[PDB]
Write a protein that binds this ligand. Structure first.
Ligand SMILES: Cc1cc2nc3c(=O)[nH]c(=O)nc-3n(C[C@H](O)[C@H](O)[C@H](O)COP(=O)(O)O)c2cc1C
Ligand SMILES: O=C(O)c1cc(=O)[nH]c(=O)[nH]1
Length: 367
């Protein structure tokens, strides 16, 4: 627990955290432990090969902690200490709200998957604002060091006007963020995903873009859309088209999935909610691929979904991701996995004659 070995956390400690605590308390302990920085300071040095400049920022390694782990920005600094190259803080809603009734998270250890239906449990804009404000200049220094911060916006359950909620996020948190995320891909909030529709998405993102533009230069973040893995091809076409039109700065590719692949062994496979972890991977990768192609490599993509190795990582990059985020992999292999991905990602780049992550982005669309 002090040295930071993968093979220990994998077989012993992590199956015991699981064996002892329900998935929610485990997450909360993890957030506590991480904000306190109890974790090992990662053995692995980041080589220059992993550096990516994208979105008006240098990223020291391309492996991000995904939205959901740190819903309320309590653990940003420990996440960096864990070795992520960039941190994203979990969907924040304008007003605080509590989320769906427990139980709302489940492990499918046999599938290395998770299903969650939290439905945007948030401390809300005020609280997260003060939290981020209180390290604002630390963050400024971090970004310049190649550790950018992303903020991921969602909408209140009751909210009558979707576009106005996100507007509030841009206004309140936009100034504290290197990039902002319009999350319209959560499975768990009645009607949210239908904001992925062309007309409804253009009107929403016009307003987001507009607000963003009204922020001062130094506090003017990049704006991306996080989309679902369950989109029809018409949907993807459209998202793609609107994106190019309004000049959106990027996409985060794939929230969790409401599909349930043939093969899930998990006793809890038929729980309502978003499916994450391994069963999402290739689905997720394929969506990076369609989106990269549709936007013609001119729209940066953050790949997320089932990443738990260098290969997993490098696959999405070759697919066209500029950056990847993982989350679930953390509930199975623990902190070490960040080290792993980075180091396996590194090896593979060399093995396949790449100079660095930058050369390998979209690599598949040129081979
Ligand atoms: C417990 C849980 C909560 C999540 N919460 C959010 C969320 O608030 N906002 C969001 O954009 N994504 C959320 N995600 C989805 C992740 O951001 C990610 O898109 C998905 O899990 C695929 O990556 P992974 O398999 O490595 O976890 C959540 C995922 C899980 C595991
Ligand atoms: O908080 C949630 O319920 C949630 C939001 C989201 O965007 N994705 C997810 O899997 N869960």
């Amino acid at each position: 627990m002090a040295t930071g070995d993968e093979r220990f956390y994998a077989e012993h400690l992590m199956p015991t955290l699981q064996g002892l605590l329900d998935p929610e308390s485990a997450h909360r302990l993890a957030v506590r432990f991480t904000s306190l920085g109890l974790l090992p300071r990662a053995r692995f040095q980041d080589s220059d090969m992993l550096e990516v400049r994208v979105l008006g920022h240098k990223f020291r390694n391309p492996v991000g902690i995904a939205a959901g782990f740190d819903k309320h920005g309590e653990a940003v600094d420990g996440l960096y200490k864990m070795g992520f190259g960039f941190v994203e803080i979990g969907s924040v809603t304008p007003k605080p709200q509590e989320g769906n009734p427990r139980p709302r998270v489940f492990r499918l250890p046999e599938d290395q998957a998770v299903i969650n239906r939290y439905g945007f449990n948030s401390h809300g804009l005020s609280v997260v604002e003060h939290r981020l404000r209180a390290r604002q200049q630390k963050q400024a220094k971090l970004t310049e060091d190649g550790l950018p911060l992303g903020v991921n916006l969602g909408k209140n359950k009751t909210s009558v006007d979707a576009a106005e909620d996100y507007a509030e996020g841009v206004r309140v948190l936009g100034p504290l963020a290197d990039y902002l995320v319009v999350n319209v891909s959560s499975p768990n909030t009645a009607g949210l995903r239908s904001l992925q529709g062309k007309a409804e998405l253009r009107r929403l993102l016009t307003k987001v873009l507009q607000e963003r533009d009204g922020l001062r230069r130094v506090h003017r973040p990049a704006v991306l859309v996080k989309i679902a893995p369950d989109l029809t091809s018409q949907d993807k076409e459209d998202i793609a088209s609107v994106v190019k039109e309004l000049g959106i700065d990027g996409l985060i590719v794939t929230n969790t999935t409401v599909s349930r692949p043939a093969g899930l062994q998990g006793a809890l496979r038929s729980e309502t909610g978003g499916l994450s972890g391994k069963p999402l991977r290739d689905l997720s990768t394929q969506t990076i691929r369609e989106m990269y192609a549709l936007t013609q490599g001119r729209v940066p993509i953050i790949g997320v979904g089932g990443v738990s190795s260098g290969q997993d990582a490098l696959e999405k990059i070759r697919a066209g991701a500029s950056l990847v985020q993982l989350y679930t992999a953390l509930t199975f292999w623990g902190p070490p996995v960040v080290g792993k991905v980075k180091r396996e990602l590194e090896a593979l780049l060399k093995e396949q004659g790449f100079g660095g992550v930058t050369d390998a982005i979209g690599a598949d669309h040129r081979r």
